[PDB]
A paper describes a structure:
Classical Zn2+-dependent deac(et)ylases play fundamental regulatory roles in life and are well characterized in eukaryotes regarding their structures, substrates and physiological roles. Structurally, these enzymes are composed of a central eight-stranded parallel β-sheet flanked by α-helices on each site, known as the α/β-arginase/deacetylase fold. All active site residues were conserved, as shown by the multiple sequence alignment and the structural alignment, suggesting a general acid/base catalytic mechanism for the bacterial enzymes as described for the eukaryotic counterparts. These enzymes mediate catalysis using a penta-coordinated catalytic Zn2+ ion coordinated by two aspartates and a histidine (KpHdaH (1b): Asp181, Asp269, His183).
To explain the molecular basis for classical deacylases to act as polyamine deacetylases, we structurally characterized the enzyme PsApaH. The crystal structure of PsApaH confirmed the analytical SEC experiments supporting cluster 4 enzymes forming head-to-head dimers. Dimer formation is mediated by a structural feature distinct to polyamine deacetylases, i.e. L2-loop (PSL: polyamine-specificity loop). An important specificity-determining interaction is a salt bridge between R95 of the L2-loop of one monomer and D163 of the other monomer of the dimer. The N-terminal L1-loop interacts in trans with the L2-loop, occluding the active site and thereby restricting the access of acetylated peptides. This L1-loop is highly flexible in the apo form, as it was not resolved in our apo structure of PsApaH. In our PsApaH structure, Y168 exists in two alternative conformations supporting the flexibility in the unliganded state. In PsApaH, this Glu106 is replaced by His106 explaining the higher acetylpolyamine substrate promiscuity for PsApaH. PsApaH and the P. aeruginosa enzymes PA1409 and PA0321 also contain the PIS-motif, which explains the higher level of promiscuity observed for bacterial polyamine deacetylases. Notably, the bacterial polyamine deacetylases also contain a conserved RPP-motif (PsApaH (4)/M. ramosa ApaH: 154-RPPGHH-159) and an XGGY-motif (PsApaH (4)/M. ramosa ApaH: 320-EGGY−323), identified for robust deacetylases such as KpHdaH (1b) but not present in deacylases with activity for longer acyl-chains, suggesting these enzymes prefer to remove acetyl-groups from polyamines but no longer acyl-chains. Only the cluster 4 enzyme ApaH from Pseudomonas sp., PsApaH, showed activity as polyamine deacetylase.
Author numbering:
A (entry chain A): -2 to 6, 31 to 342
B (entry chain B): -1 to 7, 31 to 342
The structure:
Amino acid sequence: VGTMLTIYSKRADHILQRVKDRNIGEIREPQDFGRDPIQRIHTAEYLNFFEGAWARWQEQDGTGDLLPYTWPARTLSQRLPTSLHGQLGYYSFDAGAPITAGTWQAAYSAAQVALTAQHEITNGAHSAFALCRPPGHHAASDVMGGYCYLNNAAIAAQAFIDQGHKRVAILDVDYHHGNGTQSIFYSRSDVLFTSIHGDPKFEFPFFLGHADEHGEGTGEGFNINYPLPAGSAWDSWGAALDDACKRINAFDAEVVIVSLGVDTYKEDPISQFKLDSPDYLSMGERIAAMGLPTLFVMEGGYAVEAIGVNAVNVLEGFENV
Amino acid sequence: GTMLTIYSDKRADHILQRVKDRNIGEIREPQDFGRDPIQRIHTAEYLNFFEGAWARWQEQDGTGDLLPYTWPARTLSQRLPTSLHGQLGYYSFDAGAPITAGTWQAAYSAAQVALTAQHEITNGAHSAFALCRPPGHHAASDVMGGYCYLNNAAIAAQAFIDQGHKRVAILDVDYHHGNGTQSIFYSRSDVLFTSIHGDPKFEFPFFLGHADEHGEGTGEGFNINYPLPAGSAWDSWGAALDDACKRINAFDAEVVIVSLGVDTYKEDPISQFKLDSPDYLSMGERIAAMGLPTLFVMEGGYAVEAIGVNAVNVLEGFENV
Ligand SMILES: [Cl-]
Ligand SMILES: [K+]
Ligand SMILES: [K+]
Ligand SMILES: [K+]
Ligand SMILES: [K+]
Ligand SMILES: [K+]
Ligand SMILES: [K+]
Ligand SMILES: [Zn+2]
Ligand SMILES: [Zn+2]
């Protein structure tokens, strides 16, 4: 099948090269669907802060990245200050989301890539590939972090619901927890969130991703975390994947949005799992086994030499079935 | 001189030199009063973690200084990981309390310095000066940050209680809100906390120190924050101090513990207040006007030329009355 469409605006080199080489499908640049769909997920205050945060930082002759150095952690009140760094902490949970001169445009653009690829599936396609940089799954509704500024996968999922789908499901195969994606839908039952990550007991982001986070309110039952121990290989990982996909199918998801990080690779420096490039074909073949329209959204992965092979193996395997 | 100074082992140079020159009183090494009084404020889990942190970092060949890089901020669980770094971010609220080779012994030693000066007062001295480094008022019961690891002032406050007193009051004159001290006694009314500081809406620690934080439960009404705008001078600052001292006295404090920071100085690089060297004399007289036995605990104050002059002016003006 030469059917899946890739959307794109060193690392995207290897991915895009492998997309042509393995004949996944055509590549197209994004269209601009505006700020409204992003604001279906992110609060207006957060988007406004984000739009003007670097301009405000140049108003003080600030040199280098804009970065938070204080956070509203335990014993403190979760109350919004007015100074620029005070707010940056309010809207963040680590020092991993640095703001520079092009961060907003770059983040806005990634959400459009996701939304474009999203609209391909609405216009009849069975699958698409949103090659997003920066990634998004660590970003919550008004918290940024871990190189995530806007939650592309959550924005694409929300688009599917606003376009008439009763239920959809996010499957997050990134090595890290989708703490932002979890937080965004934590109390909803129209979006199921599954995630296979390194156990937050030892792994970033530490403070979400435990298996006993099932949702709150009406979203109880529709948050499913699969924390695995360091050293995990495909026998454990793929057994989590099997359980997760069965859950998605019993939830009667009408589309599945795949948060595709390939930093599970054994040669990835941030990884503590032991997946090999063959494992990614198998991950595509199992995801395809759900029989649903499937949107793949790029998340994490160090620009190793094999990032194109690892990521496009999922798409290859998907189209294999 | 009638006021003893306790000191351990670069600002201290200027301060001790000015304590000698102005004949403030003797200068004495601390004693070890043990872990128990530190533990009347801080959790044993926090004390064990902090004292073993450097050692675990060197057991995993840690490169340099030990610092957190993730925090249980908004949308995250305040739940403790097992990872060294996850634990560290759980026990902190910012990146400004690093842990290196000598750190827990240095923090332990400041608490001991504070306890020795507290002890001089219990034995019949009207005042004493704890020349603590590192400072303490940003540390809560089990949160660290702002170069504060153990809350010196709060440990000495509680010692006064454990040694007989019904009621004590803490006066935090540092330019910054003493968030950890407000936290430690927030639902208590035998310990009245007051603080004058740059409005947290723009000044660190950002997320505590608003005027509407009056206390919790039976601590309701026993926590008095005086946030001030940037550019404040003695007409405003002395007004807060005059109201705070009135209210300490209305409280029947038997001992007042002053968390003494001099980073309110106009020439201090961190300050957004405009206090002058003679202002610290007026400050000392006004505290002494309260009529109470008074323990002075060093906090902030960048190592400018005048730090010794300013700090010792509060003690001089105290002894003038
Ligand atoms: Cl990531
Ligand atoms: K982003
Ligand atoms: K994941
Ligand atoms: K949900
Ligand atoms: K204090
Ligand atoms: K203060
Ligand atoms: K109190
Ligand atoms: Zn990742
Ligand atoms: Zn200070």
